[PDB]
Write a protein that binds this DNA or RNA. Structure first.
Length: 92
RNA sequence: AGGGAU
């Protein structure tokens, strides 16, 4: 066993450069894969991201591989890879 | 508009 509150490829990002998007999350996980339109980016009234995001990797197995990117960097800043579930990304 | 240990 490796989880107790999730069983899907859903995950969460934080530490984002306030300018990262689907294209930066996917290059950050370019050694991995993500499902089509599987990324979401909450924003403020200003239309700028809250500093965190949500994704759906290819099933719960891919999400667990992406956890190796915890505290890893996107190019000049470090990122985090908390887990998630549909109940945090159902904004679809 | 920060980090937050998650």
């Amino acid at each position: 066993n490796s989880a107790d509150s999730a069983n899907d490829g859903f995950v969460r990002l934080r530490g984002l450069p306030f300018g990262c998007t689907k294209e930066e999350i996917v290059q950050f996980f370019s050694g991995l894969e993500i499902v089509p339109n599987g990324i979401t980016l909450p924003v403020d009234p200003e239309g700028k991201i809250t500093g965190e995001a949500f994704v759906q990797f290819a099933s719960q197995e891919l999400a667990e591989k992406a956890l190796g990117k915890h505290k890893e960097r996107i190019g000049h800043r470090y990122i985090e890879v908390f887990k998630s579930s549909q109940e945090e990304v159902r904004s679809y």
